[PDB]
Amino acid sequence: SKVTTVVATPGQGPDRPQEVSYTDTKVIGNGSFGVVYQAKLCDSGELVAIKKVLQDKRFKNRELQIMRKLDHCNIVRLRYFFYSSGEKKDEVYLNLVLDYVPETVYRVARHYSRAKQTLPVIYVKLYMYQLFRSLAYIHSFGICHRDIKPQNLLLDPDTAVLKLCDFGSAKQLVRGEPNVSYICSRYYRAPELIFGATDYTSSIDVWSAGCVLAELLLGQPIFPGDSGVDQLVEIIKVLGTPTREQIREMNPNYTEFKFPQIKAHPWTKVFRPRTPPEAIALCSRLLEYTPTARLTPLEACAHSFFDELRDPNVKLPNGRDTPALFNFTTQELSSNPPLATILIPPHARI
């Protein structure tokens, strides 16, 4: 093959650009955002993913500035970054060198779906836990991902480690400042987002995680629909018609419309009878009309549904040990520090 060399800037470093060489360049992803390459470093021989996007250069890249602030085991790490050309000459391309992660949660869940099987609860516990852990991290910086979906949840089948990716729709939410409501991926949109609310918080990610948890248990998306109304009908068909104050919490502009009152469908009749009650309990406190009523990511990690993960004798179905789930930092626990009593087992701290 051929070896390419560029002067790339360390993402989490003190801004000291260095030489970086790589080979085995091939495309593993194409989209309207740009192109994603796979590559092997000439130095360590490690595989990386290269997200190549366009840049207006007149203004700073929001995705880059967020990634440079992130260092977490459950968020894909920014190795380096550099600028180059590509298709459509006379423009500057931004290259994000990221940790290469083989699979995604979606593709894995899709396997059991077409195999007519059910994703084992232990994986539902593992994947969801690491997700909230990632959510708890970025929320402490006031950074909202806004595009939480199974496709953006990368997996390493061997170590069973989850790494959140695609911060292209991410934004640091400032209190009392307007926000785009046409954000987020459908099926996983919060009800306030569908109502056009621009005063939404980071709890929209919690709603999305709730959709993911439900989809993993159900084998299919819980709120399908092309349009916003379509999705909202599906939500109402489960949670029931939202009350006036619940509507106020989401978007006050829809407070006085008198929608037909539909009875809520029991959570137990929603999932298969094989479903553990704890999973159902976690889901009900996740999918709430009122944003403030929804659990915080850090609070979700301490749910009883994840008690099996805090067992000393827990093991992966392939024999290997579970990933680091208890290495919480202080910034990570900034939301609610007394939760460490539950989140960190006695056999972990000692």
């Binding site: 056009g196 916003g228 109304v229 909202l232 009908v233 109402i236 068909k237 018609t241 978007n251 502009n253 829809y254 419309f257 008198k258 929608f259 037909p260 539909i262």
Partner: peptide, 18 residues
């Protein structure tokens, strides 16, 4: 008149699944 139009479509859909 965005919320007015949106609400009507929703009410219409909800009256049908009632």
């Amino acid at each position: 008149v965005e919320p007015q139009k949106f609400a009507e479509e929703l009410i219409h859909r909800l009256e049908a699944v009632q």
